[model samples]
Target chain A: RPVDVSVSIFINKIYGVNTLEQTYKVDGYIVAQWTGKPRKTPGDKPLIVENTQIERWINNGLWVPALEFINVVGSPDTGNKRLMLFPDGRVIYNARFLGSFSNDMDFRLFPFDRQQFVLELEPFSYNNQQLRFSDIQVYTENIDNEEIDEWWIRGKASTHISDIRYDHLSSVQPNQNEFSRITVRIDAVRNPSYYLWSFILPLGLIIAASWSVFWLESFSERLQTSFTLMLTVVAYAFYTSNILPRLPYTTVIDQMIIAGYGSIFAAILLIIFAHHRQANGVEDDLLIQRCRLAFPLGFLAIGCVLVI
Target chain B: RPVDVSVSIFINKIYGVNTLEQTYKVDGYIVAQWTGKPRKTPGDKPLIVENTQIERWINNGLWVPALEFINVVGSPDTGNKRLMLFPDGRVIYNARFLGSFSNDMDFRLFPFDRQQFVLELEPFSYNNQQLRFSDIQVYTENIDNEEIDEWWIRGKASTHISDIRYDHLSSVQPNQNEFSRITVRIDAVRNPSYYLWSFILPLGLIIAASWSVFWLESFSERLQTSFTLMLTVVAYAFYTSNILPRLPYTTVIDQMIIAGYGSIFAAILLIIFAHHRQANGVEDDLLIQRCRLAFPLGFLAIGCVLVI
Candidate 1:
């Protein structure tokens, strides 16, 4: 009969997610419990075994199933290993580890995006016929709400077990073999506060300054001021690129930058147009000349349209 | 005595570099060659040990040093482990593997950046005193120049063996120990052709159109046109952000976009200034009105200055 193993993971700390690397580091403790044949004990007392003694049992052909972290990049830094042997037949193996795990992450929405961190575990040498997962649990208590950070935990946790088929591994004609796997997922969202305050605020100011070109005394003053405004926007864009995460697609912040460029360019077009149009035989069109307020307000309306 | 082993890696395929994940996949064959103490042989014939037989020898206590890929993210999938034993006491271990490796990559230059793919190998349990790297070799032949890919190979392979320290592993106070490590590197450059033809060309057309606003017969025509040009530039920026890789620093292509914004803004300033200035005590200046030719040529000069 296949042995049933109960598992639990207690997360201690999760940090350092490199977007370019698609890898995250996780520090936690894992507990695996199973029942073996009842063993003789001294006065029905439970027996305890530490790291070195547990290895000795393994060398002597102890039936300890190997549990492997499927998503882990390399071997995890195992801290301490312990074994709890009960008088009744139950046995538990507990260990602390820090591992780097791989996940396929999409950053298309970027600052406004939601992501899920995942962990997969399965038996290394035994199939479902030999070993199976009975239940899995995740403990979450160390997370603090008051702390400010780049990512926010959205919910508690979830787990599932399914059979995975490896088509390439089997050699029989019409090759098919299934292995049991347990998966854990933790969902999170990125905080956009930092980007809005640092990136969006300065961009708004530059666009406003460019709009002030309409209030200039003459065509030369308005035109020349726009040139400086244009240069400022260019400098701002470079500054933004220096601090934002690199991705193949644009985020919400990137769109705002494009808006800034357009706002400045439009101001230039209007400054030239007002001087040339002499409607009603007037020297200058007063309505168009005073577009100082119109352009800024108009840009805001246009900007709102782009978001939705 | 510790046996000296010569290691060689034959790269079969290297692809799928996830820029955001900073992880790359490598498929290759690893060969370990070493000479053992001379032993008596049956009829002076060479001996051969296959996969299952080799495991039997290991279980009976054969001294096969474990060489591990230090930077590999999880355990590697090893295929077809072979052992060739000679009557003169020589042995060779060859195996094929596919693994994902983690690298600390700096992509500040982005599209125009140069990078090196790396591989690190070290002994699992033995320190330098027990096991040392005799030498390392790399075989590269499948890399082709005719392929138009995202990354271009820039140079030949390089290898070195060094001592790596682990302070936390030692049990003694002020923990210090050094392990032997073999490192391999292959330099490559990102191909910028995609960004140049697709992003740069379209940006140039938009900036050129903005300059034509200066050629309008009246100020109204020029000003209204600037509004449209402004909108165009904004749309272009959005397009750019959608496709370009997000980074903390601006790339060469990013600077070009900024330059486009600056040129148009500069034109706006000069357009209004030309009409308002009275150098010859005239209401309208013909020289300034026809600055049509001057701004475009002037922009070219300024654009060149930015690059140098």
Candidate 2:
């Protein structure tokens, strides 16, 4: 039996990568084709199908294989439904899938680093069924490719058709029948230089700037800024949360946030303690001036050990 | 010309959602089928193709059409590749896909509310390419489904397929040919009810517990517990960063962290002030002692404004 099938795929947009987890996500479409012979009907009436009954047929005798993500660190997100193609080639496939992308990432500094996003796609089952040839075309119509966030559009895209052999399978077919699966992947590198220059560097500069308050000659100036410092830490905390992925554990950036709070709180405590300690001071404390450079260095020493 | 096509899909697990941005991710596979006429060639030369050059053939007249994900929110993630098909009716597609699962989410209470992850899948561009039948049978096995994490898997999943018609295309094609897209979606609800009862409830208890410190009759106990309360606030800050998603802006959780810090710092300030301003050797300043309830209540009043 000879069948004529034409397949077309349209890719929307892609994003989302967890560097620590080494995962990403992909969503798109598949269309299959074939011609059907005309049949007699009671009337020249058109037929309409609803969503509920279509599901009934799938549960009865449908065989959908579980696909594997070879490079994926963990299971990916899968969403929605399924479709079926009849023997007559009347096709039906509908469902939504959400999964983590699998890739190699260097996230030793995570929030401070730019991470790349990558994903791989392949079939989970079917040996006798074969892909003739597949084509991929990336859409660049909206927002001028330059305006796309998270990804830098470098070139056009396409797909290929090939065969794969899995080492472990329950049913092994002989020779040609053994061939199965398709693998598709898209790649992009992280712009590490961005977060380094913009985010991390600025935070360091701001924290350093706050430390300068110790050098002020007036106690009022030093004491007033403590509130500002408090607010600043709060602002920074907000910034970090806005940009970083939500997680259940402390990240390197999180440690920095706590450190900022500690540094400011320590300075305020000492400033207030130095001002009110009445051990004989109708005069300003001379030692407070010495603390200008010394406090920063002292804190830095503590900071270094604190990170460990 | 008649062609034979087959398809397969591999699935990894799915997780990760950004409330502020309203996005998610998915990963998986696709395979197609066709056959080529046999020709005499060398006895043992395996065919291989790499990613860089897959498009070269497409430009030289490969008939791959543009497929679109009509329902995809923004973009998708794709990974590595290897494709194969045999002399017999067998096809293999092995690749990885990672994409942001798109859905509408109402984050009015963000950190406190339950969120649903939704994904929509379909062919990007088409007039008559129907999705034959698709299955998600392959999965990375034994990846530890249950654990002490924020996400909870509801149960065994299901999928479906549907036809999507676009009314606003540059070149709109009417009739059955226009029914080309295959839409897939998956749904999951956040386990926030637990967080509300467990986390939110406990934090209220702890904060309320701190208020009781003011009731201590002795000043030493009052001041000492205030410091302990300081430590507790720090501890709570650490707990917050550990349990919540990192974001650039202050979430309800972030505000709570700030509140914890503020309560402790305010207590430290008032305690010190009361000691210094007291006249004579009066151990307990009547005005200050009265502030016990007032202090906590005052902070509560101020804390309410800080949240706004």
Candidate 3:
């Protein structure tokens, strides 16, 4: 007969989120419970076994199923181990552990991005038919913590008890091959307070000030000054990249830099076109003057679009 | 009658260690067990109550003592809470929480420093005689994790169960003012890999290369080159400071910078002396030349002294 197990996770904290590696570390306790054949104990009360002593009980033929973290990168460090054997046949296994778990993380939004840190747990040897997860409770009491070096945990650790079916079976399971999996999801939003003030605000000011290039009087002044403006944005980009976290895709900040480059390149092309439109001595003077307002307004509108 | 309670801690993780603030964050579970009044229930099995409904039992007059984190800087974020009531007399309270805890941290030897992150747990209202802690077990499963952005956990969370005597009590307990405290300590050593490769190695090269000023052919070349060397050391100092963690006192790297400054200042004084120690018409050219080898040797010996 299949053993039905009720598993609950007590998440202590979720930290050390690595965006580039798509990995985050989890610290928590795992409690797996099931009813088994009643044991004849010395007294009416339940017998408690702890740590290394529990291995002695296992050798004496205690029925304990092996559990594994499906999403964990490597073997997690385990702490105190406990087994509670009751006279009524219920057995409880409790252990504390921490591990680096992998999840699909998208940093395309960045700074203001919200992410889900997930953990997947499943049976190590038994298929879903032999041993199955009946219930999963995620007690990630992580609503928030002291916001330092932070990703604010949004809510409770959410759970899903589902069967994970495989296309190919490793052993003799043949057609009856599927595993009971417990998936835990924790929501987190990056605290963008530091980035808004330090990175974005400064970059925004530099980009906004770059528009002042058009304010210069003559064609020579505007054309030559745009070169300096281009150099300034490039200079600021290098300095900003030094401190920011590395990510594969372009973030909101990265998009802003790209827009900055595009704005300058467009302004340079327009500056040349305005001077050479008629193919004769300075063409339309009003077109060049009108660009000062039009370009700033157009760039501002494009910035708004990126946010949406 | 007074109740004797046994408490155990299961540490999931220790992170966000702040040196200047003297704070560190902890994520773990606190389990407290005590034998209580026997209960008559529907079945012989133990009763389990979880989450919000546990408060209902508390409101219905279940005697749950108020436990507080003595050294926690602020209220911790608490998660899946539980209470286990057995058919006989035993009761268990289990909860998961995360907190920012304060501890006296001395980072005087930083980049090569070892630290102890501690947690203090005590009964909030009950004095030692009223609610004594019979035993304390620390299960900080924290041996190690994937060596990343890291502090390597040294050993199991060490424990000290002691009675804390208060000089003054607000409740006029007179001489009988003592409380049971559980002190949990986790040892960690910072991963100095990044600091050694990126910071120390480059800085060491700069200081060692600064000694090349002694290799210059002429007296004018040797004296002039050191001024450039002094400027180089200062420039390198600024670049390094931009990336290093800020601290109130000098760290090992900070001391090395000070040594660099001292070397240059000493060499400047010697450069002047070697030229003028002859006092009149260059009485001994041998003394000035001897400084080339002697000064480098002296600086090297002084560098060795700094490390010791």
Tell me, by lDDT, which candidate is best: 3
Measured with C-alpha atoms, the lDDT of residue A198 in candidate 3 is: 88
Cα lDDT for residue A193, candidate 2: 56
Query: What CAPRI grade goes to candidate 1?
Result: incorrect
Give candidate 1 regions above 4 Å deviation.
A40-44, A142-144, A171-176, A277-287, A306-308, B1-308
**C-alpha RMSD over true interface residues, each candidate:** 8.9, 12.4, 14.0
Stretches of candidate 2 off by over 4 Å are: A1-108, A111-189, A192-194, A218-221, A243-255, A275-284, A304-308, B1-11, B16-308
Off by over 4 Å in 3: A1-308, B142-149, B170-175, B277-285
Judge candidate 3 at residue A205 and give its lDDT: 84
Weakest lDDT window of 10 consecutive positions for candidate 3 chain A:
A166-175
Clashing pairs for model 3 are: A141-B79
lDDT of 1 by residue, A127-211 (tens): 6766789999998664576248677887787998888864432122432256788899999888888877888777777777777
Candidate 3 lDDT, A128-183, residue by residue in tens:
87788999988866353447747887767789999877543212346456889999
Residue B205's lDDT within candidate 1 is 46
The whole-model C-alpha lDDT of candidate 1 against the native structure comes to: 0.71
Choose 1 or 2, whichever is better by DockQ: 1
**Which window of 10 residues has the lowest lDDT sum in candidate 2 chain A?**
A132-141
lDDT of 1 by residue, B113-192 (tens): 78899999999988776677889988875555423345667777899989988866745644237788899999888766
Model 3, position A274, has a per-residue lDDT of 72
